[PDB]
Amino acid sequence: GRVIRGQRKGRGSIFKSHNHHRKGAAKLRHLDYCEKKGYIKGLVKDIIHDPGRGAPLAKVIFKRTEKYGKKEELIIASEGMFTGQYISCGTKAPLSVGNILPIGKMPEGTLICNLEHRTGNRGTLVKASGCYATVVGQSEDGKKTKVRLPSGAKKTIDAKARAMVGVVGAGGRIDKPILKAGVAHHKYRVKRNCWPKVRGVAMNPVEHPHGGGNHQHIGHPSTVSRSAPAGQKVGLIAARRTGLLRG
Amino acid sequence: SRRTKKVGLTGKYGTRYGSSLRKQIKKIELMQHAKYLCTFCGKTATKRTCVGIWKCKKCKRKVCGGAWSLTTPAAVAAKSTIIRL
Amino acid sequence: AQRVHYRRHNHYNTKSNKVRPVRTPGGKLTIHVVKKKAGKPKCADCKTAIQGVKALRPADNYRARRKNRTVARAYGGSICARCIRERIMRAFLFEEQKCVRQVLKE
Amino acid sequence: PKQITDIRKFLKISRKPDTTAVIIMKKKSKTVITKLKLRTKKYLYTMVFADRKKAERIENSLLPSLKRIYYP
Amino acid sequence: VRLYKLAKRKGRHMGIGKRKGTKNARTNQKTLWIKRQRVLRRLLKRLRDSKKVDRHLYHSF
Amino acid sequence: GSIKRFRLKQRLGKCRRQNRPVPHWYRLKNTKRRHWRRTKLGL
RNA sequence: UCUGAUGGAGGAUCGAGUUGAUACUGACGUGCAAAUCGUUCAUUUCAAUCACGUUUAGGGGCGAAAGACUAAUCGAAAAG
RNA sequence: GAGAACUUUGAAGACUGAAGUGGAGAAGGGUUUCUUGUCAACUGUGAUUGAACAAGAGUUAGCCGCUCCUAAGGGAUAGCUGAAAAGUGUUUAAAGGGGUCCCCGUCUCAAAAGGGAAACAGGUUGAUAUUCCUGUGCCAAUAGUAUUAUGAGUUAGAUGGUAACAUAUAUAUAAAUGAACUCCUUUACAUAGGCUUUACACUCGGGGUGCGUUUUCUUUGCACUUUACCUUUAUAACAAACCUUGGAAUCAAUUUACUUGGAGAAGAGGUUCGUUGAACUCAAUUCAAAAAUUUGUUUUGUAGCAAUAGUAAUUCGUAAUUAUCCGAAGUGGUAAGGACUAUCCUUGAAAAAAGGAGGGAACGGCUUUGUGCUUUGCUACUCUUAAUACUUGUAUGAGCGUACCAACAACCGCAUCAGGUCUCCAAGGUUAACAGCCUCUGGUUAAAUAGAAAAAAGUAGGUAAGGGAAGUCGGCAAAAUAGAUCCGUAACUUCGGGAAAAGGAUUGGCUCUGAGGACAUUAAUGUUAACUCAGAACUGAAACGGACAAGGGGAAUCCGACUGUUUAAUUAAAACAUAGCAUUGUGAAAAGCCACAACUGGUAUUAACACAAUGUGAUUUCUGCCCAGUGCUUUG
RNA sequence: UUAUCCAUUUAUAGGGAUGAAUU
């Protein structure tokens, strides 16, 4: 056989991200003494569209404290935040929508985004449009707090990790039915070369384990083990179950 | 006079796609193309610029909102809980 | 009718190669490349066009006189008059409120 | 090319040491109208005379140091 | 062609058997509407300027 | 084309110069000859 | 609710051009041509068309998937 | 000329028909270009021709391009791998610049369509022209000292307007102090729709000049009647934005459309930019009224360039003279600009380079004490342009391309091959039309041949009585209307469609009638413009979308929902894709999927509304039972 | 926590109570 499409993806030739018009990586402020023991307020000057993603980005201008001047940060905007608004980042920042706080300072039940799964990595979790995590518990001694992620998984992160208060905007995007193939074409034109798909069952056996035959069927179970090699992992990978969920 | 009985703005799609799909897209396009109340100036003139960005024609001020509406119930509820304290 | 041809080595209808016909004293219809229109200078705050300043491309702006590159008022040529007015009132009043807050603290 | 209207600036430019030639153009109009054109390093300065007497007097008062070019 | 244009001016080669484009292609309906609207608005402005109608009457009309 | 590099133009000139016949006074005692339409320079 | 205008949406329609290639299983088939010619046909606001530049190289690439294409060479190119 | 169907000239008949064998370029070619010879071979017939052969010649740039910038990206450095070859490219880098310690900082290449300092007209050759000549401009650069001269400012930095903002007009609007450190703007950006302005294009009428028709008619038909860059071109006008005043519901202003307003509308008066580029009495000038310099009235000038050039004419030795080059408009084709509206799960480059601002570091001159500072006595002094003189190495403008073809014989197809091959300009008539057909400018009358004859057969078309698919696997092929206006339009339907359903009528020419606008005078009277509809008589071998151009419809069944894509050269489909639906894995740098020999990497400028792996394939209605088998998976 | 590994940055302040802001 030959190398299958999934295997070709990792070579990164034509499958690199289409990022010509991206506005920059969305990262919150690098950890600083000001955020460790106080508040620093940045003024949001514009809310822009990053072509790759659905969530709007916010350009926030902070005034540097080490030297005279301003620094521009590209944060992922939470819903309801508006140009001309001052957002506070730090341990003593008030709990308000758009502010960046350590998750240990937030009470239980607050909705957060731009979660830092490890302290200081300036934003890793809960970043897609409309997503939010919930602070569902703080440790007795502090130093640790538990959140519920948009997938429903419970995660335990040290209390010093920062997050934005609120929900990342552009929520409900998935609700619109893409009516036609052209809209999907335009959607993936600015993301990747993952579209159109072409079913493996419509291929020839040389290029896909599903290909071949006189009737367009899989012919062998489509659930493959987690240890299957690269050209073999092609169906439902390491599936614990199949068919419709019932609850 | 009244031009289309029920399709409304989805008359642009003709007969293509399902009726259910067209009705679903109508429900959300109605609010995507609607004007909302700008709480900064009080004039109902904030329209969607991009998927999540809403700009007021008068203020020229833009806010981050929903994909198809200025606000979403989840964000509104979260702000309500925050502002309760 | 007289037909024309490009003269400036660029034979494609790009925006830097926009072209205009003209009748010469010799009775010939020739073609001249027009300069690209430059955007107006814009205010640093509201991003609106600031008046009193010409809208030349950088090469022409370098040759322009200083009189039509600036406005003789504070932030003139960089901030519009309305924004400057609002900035002045804001700067004065936000220090006035700080002073009254300090005097009312005790 | 620049047109100058007042007579003092024309005389001053002619007397200025950078001027080399004066161009005399005469032509019938309907009366013969003329124009005097000082050639300087930068520009050619034209003055238009409808007055035959004025355009007789002015180039005569012009100093003969600088050369003449009669076109017609 | 000048003689043909003169005949057309008298209205002599315009019958329905001489038309090949649609009604709108021959005489743009949008252009006709724009002309009518412009002449009516011009008349209303003239009347209001000369004060032969009241401001509210002008707005209603 | 009309647009050329200096080295390419010099090569064209040399190729033209090498396309002339043997002088008669020398013949009194050439196969490496080409036509522009038949054998292309390729260089 | 109904009527007349206005308005100008749409992977809307006809249709030259472009981009293709349905049929005549026409011509040709020692051709003009190692794929052309004629008529007919499809296509034209978009998943549209073109140019140059640039990336991906052989048990590899690339594939809206025909084992298609990768210099008249492909169920494993070409050169030695 | 030895020799002429295919060399040249004249005449005729025609063609190409501004979507051109017409002009310019790119790729590719490379001298095919030009002139003069010339015919051994080639130019599939001839050939005196030629892209053949031979000898000479021809390509002129500060302004056209490259060169510079950065993009997709390429190479290299540091490392790290690897026997190396090579692979990656900041992954423990002490890696040039600026001011005067500190700040910033991998290098280099990659666009002759992106960004970008600056040129026009006329003429000129056998062959080059924004390159030569003539004239007129523009851009960049111009070191040190000293003189002059130009301007400002000064007893260390100007002034007007309430404001929007404006002001330096010297030959030349050159100078309106300004350090470090900053913050912005320009460069700089998608698509669709109409509206509008301007230039060019086309066209109508008048005047002049020349030509043509003239059996007859014809105040006639045709041609010319031109005006570049540059001068912040000055102004004028207009879309907008802004300022002052004003203070809005009986809401008003206003667009084709909607747009806007107590966060300040209308009205009135202004400011600016942008369009354009002599518009407007624009400038100068003549005449009356305002005062110790304003408003009204005339002449000149294509505003300067500019007529000296160009064009079309009339003459004169054969190079010169003379006359014209000015009075009004319509259509909307192309291009650009403007102000808008709308669309996106699509938001539509960067840098070189340039500009503006915040800030306020430094501070006259002549002489003098002490150690750059306090000091004493006097004041007219600092920048900015230009020229000159001397020093400074020689104190303007580098190098490369520039001919020609661009297919029709100069390119690629083995060729002088009916193929292929990117871009710009785009006249008149008919017309919806850059369609078709015909025509003007330009080009051509050439095609590996001609003459004659003209049967069979072939090929590309026409037409056929009566019948009308009986033909054939199959209506294959052909035929049938087919434009426009008016009328009429079913089942079914996802209510959007079906639909041009089906199916009827009309259409020429001529003579008329009616309707649809703009401009001024003291409600009433004149001047003047588009083609667009509607109606009526008359007329003809009943014909009129007269050529050209131009749907066959209907009743159903199967498949695929649709737009789209595909086996380059036998399969275009019911195949692929698709939206929709469903399932699976993954909470992260000790993760999922994938690449790599290693190092390391892609997704990832990513983070579950995400990425990855599958199946099905719009909508509607549904999606039953089986975990025995084989897979997959969960606990110990 | 010293080997080793990971993340962030300009390696830019020891722990407790919508004007600018630099010499």
Curated annotation (Swiss-Prot), chain B:
SUPFAM superfamilies: Zn-binding ribosomal proteins. Transmembrane segments: none annotated. Its main location: cytoplasm. Keywords: Cytoplasm, Metal-binding, Ribonucleoprotein, Ribosomal protein, Zinc, Zinc-finger. Pfam families: Ribosomal_L37ae (PF01780). One of its GO terms (cellular component) is cytosolic ribosome. It is found in: Cytoplasm. One of its GO terms (molecular function) is zinc ion binding. GO terms for biological process: translation. A zinc finger (C4-type) spans 38-59. NCBIfam families: eL43_euk_arch. Component of the large ribosomal subunit. Mature ribosomes consist of a small (40S) and a large (60S) subunit. The 40S subunit contains about 32 different proteins and 1 molecule of RNA (18S). The 60S subunit contains about 42 different proteins and 3 molecules of RNA (28S, 5.8S and 5S). Component of the ribosome, a large ribonucleoprotein complex responsible for the synthesis of proteins in the cell. The small ribosomal subunit (SSU) binds messenger RNAs (mRNAs) and translates the encoded message by selecting cognate aminoacyl-transfer RNA (tRNA) molecules. The large subunit (LSU) contains the ribosomal catalytic site termed the peptidyl transferase center (PTC), which catalyzes the formation of peptide bonds, thereby polymerizing the amino acids delivered by tRNAs into a polypeptide chain. HAMAP family: Ribosomal_eL43. Belongs to the eukaryotic ribosomal protein eL43 family. This is Large ribosomal subunit protein eL43. The gene is RPL37A.
